[model samples]
Target: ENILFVDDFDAKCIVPDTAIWKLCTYANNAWSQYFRGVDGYENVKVEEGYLKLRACKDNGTYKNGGVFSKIGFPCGTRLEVKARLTKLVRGGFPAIWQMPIGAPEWPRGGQIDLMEWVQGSPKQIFQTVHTFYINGENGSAGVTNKEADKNFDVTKDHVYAVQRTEKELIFYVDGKETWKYENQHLDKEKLQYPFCEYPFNIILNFSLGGELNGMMTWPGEIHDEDLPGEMWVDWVRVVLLD
Candidate 1:
């Protein structure tokens, strides 16, 4: 095994160093329901040797933070992120996830969620694998409906990770196996199994409510009384195993 990437947040910076991470500017650009109208870059910063992603209401608009790696990791790589939800009331959705790099299409390229802690569900961490042929529209043929673990205190620091190989994708929480997805090469004509073929970019973000059809969904809606929310990341590491 060889170490491929590491970010300990040893240096303090307003936003993550531009050299390694790209601060997202768009709001609700894709399928996300979090960002409705404000630039999320301002909410992301690195201070006191840790990456801080905060969410708050600013002048009647909800603002949050998100960042993606400049690089991507191919198969045979393991990614780990140590983080905790410092203060999250209703509507907070903190995640450590990844999306395919070169491919533009959504589920066709696949999505991997290492950890997602929605405020509605306290002490629970959810992980999922989204693929084109296995999503809700297609009756979830090969889909593994939202794997989660609720025994741990998610507000405290914990290692959320995923180890991807050609054969399978395995998820872990604090080094303990949580879930696994085996490669289903069902459709050779199209990419039904994109995780084994594409390199994925690491992502970190804190979201508040998911908007859909003029209302909040999933983790539900947030009230201004909850005001500001904070998520802290201690370190992130990625390695390639031979």
Candidate 2:
């Protein structure tokens, strides 16, 4: 493969491309939004060339933003993203994940959700994988689902891909190939195959509602006239496959 990186969000700037992403001033650590320069509230942007992740609603709180990817790639990589899903409401969830790099542990430092969309699955789009051998026992065999055409239009563009090969973990959407996960590799000292030794990064969230033990529940109810909702991004590529 060749192109080890690309961002096409051309930097018409509003936020995003701080030398290749970082705009997530707190996700899973709290706040989870309004941090595109620490609370100045821009909801992550890059306009015209696309790469937005809005979900705005300040005052009563509800902003949105996510970016993390200062560089991390291992396991033959392949990435690719091109996205879409604007105006989504009902507790939106837009995602395009991956984690691993540095102090890893989650699912043993190997998660890779290539794409996700919620609003109660407005048109479906999910893909997952989380090692430690699929999180203590074949976690639904590493999920997979797709659908979003025929006018169900989850806003249009869609390309999501992933290829991490060493033995498995393929996936693709607008280009077809659906799912794959394989690589059971057995015992890497019990961590099973944790995507063959780290290096992941790349995330791009847009969550609006999700809590669980504290309630609020999954992407179930969020109105306020749908606030701001957006998640564009016309590009993002990567390749490394050897």
Candidate 3:
């Protein structure tokens, strides 16, 4: 087992430096719903060995946490990220995903959501792929779920993985292959999925409701009572295939 790169947050000393991570300091972006920057607080930190992303209320406005890797993974790479939600609430969203580097923008660039858990659905983990053909605008892009065995607390310390090849995209949970996709989008593409042809940057973030949650009923009113939830990341590994 040869890993091209690994971030072992828990096994390292003095914590992993923020130099490798690009934090979003903006007020808003195209993808988010509400407040989503890591406010200068304990919202994000390394405790013991885990990288924790906190979601809290900042004077009635929400302040979430996220990080992007400086490096990108090639087309034929397998990415494994081990993470869990410490607390689940209506407004809380935890996700580990990838996006095209210098992409044309949005759906044209494609989005690989390996794991996206909305509030109140702790047992069910959702995986989604977005492209021009099927997207939020068409009401066709959202969730592709692979549930766990009965009594399985899926939100607790689960491993989410994605293996991307020139020909296909595969996803797994706890080592079991649970999903795959292969298609042609732009006419002249090999995988046919033009959006994912190049390398993608890795992102790990905890967000408040936006496109997904706002559209759905319930999970009303985000409050500071939900302030202290966290997303714990033990490690992240990306390997280039031979």
Candidate 4:
């Protein structure tokens, strides 16, 4: 069964309102914060039928935006989205990911970074899964793999997909499997402990600079030479299969 739809802005900015979907804003304080650190970036906004994740200079840090689903979807579902990374000749970071809502602690509820592609490394897309049993300190018992060699044309679109089931997890890029992890560690004892039992929401954002973005090397510098970077979403969908 497939139950998903697309939202297009038609070149204007409008707030999405519906009971089935919830929107979290970076500009205001809420039950929990969706963006990373140091908020209030003026350049982040929704316009022109697409979500814009860009970087700004005056803000001292890279200015950007992000959002997550409030109504979590069930496990054993298929989720996919199509996006395009904005052209950046120098610096930028954008990603599409999912994490448990209100996770009291790190790695406990688990984090699945479905797709994280830094600007300079357009040829490679990173996939990481973080669980409570093993954190980054131990080098992610989870896996990290890159897609097959492809052209680095930021102007075009690409698809990222994931299929979660009782037995395992599978990830795909442009309809191709790039990574896979079995459910060997998801026993009842593990699930009752630090493992995630509840469903999670999806997040799409473009970050300027942070620990995740390797800000130490760039150090608050926006390379306008690579200005107008964008993350275009042609569509997003979720499906349940038996």
lDDT of 4 by residue, 134-238 (tens): 563353335566453456454468778777775667888788887776677546545323323667777776655424333232213346656556677766777
Clashes of each: 0, 0, 4, 2
The model with the greatest TM-score is 1
Q: Per-residue error at 52 for model 4, in Å?
A: 2.5
> Once model 1 is optimally superposed onto the true structure by TM-score, how far is the C-alpha of residue 185 displaced, in angstroms?
2.7
Model 2 per-residue lDDT tens digits across residues 1-242: 59888888876667777876876774352225334334643677787888887776666666677778988888877888988887667777778887887745566666888887667667676787866655765342344543433244667888888888778888887777776777777767676567757688788867676553365544656676877788888888888776
Question: Candidates' lDDT values, in order?
Answer: 0.77, 0.71, 0.70, 0.58
Question: Can you give the lDDT of residue 146 in candidate 3?
Answer: 48
**After superposition, candidate 1 runs with Cα above 4 Å error:** 27-40, 136-147
Supply candidate 2's per-residue lDDT for 17.
76
**Shift in Å, residue 208, candidate 1:** 0.9
RMSD of each: 2.6, 16.2, 3.4, 4.9
Candidate 4 TM-score, true structure as reference: 0.74
List candidate 4 stretches off by more than 4 Å: 4-13, 16-45, 59-61, 136-142, 146-154, 185-196, 210-224
Measured on C-alpha atoms, candidate 1 has an lDDT of 0.77
* Tens-digit lDDT string for candidate 3 (28-81): 342354434445534667777788887767676677777778788777789999
TM-score of each: 0.89, 0.32, 0.83, 0.74
Q: Is candidate 1 or candidate 3 better by lDDT?
A: 1
Candidate with the larger TM-score of 1 and 3: 1
Give the Å error, residue 150, model 3: 7.4
Clashes counted in candidate 2 amount to 0
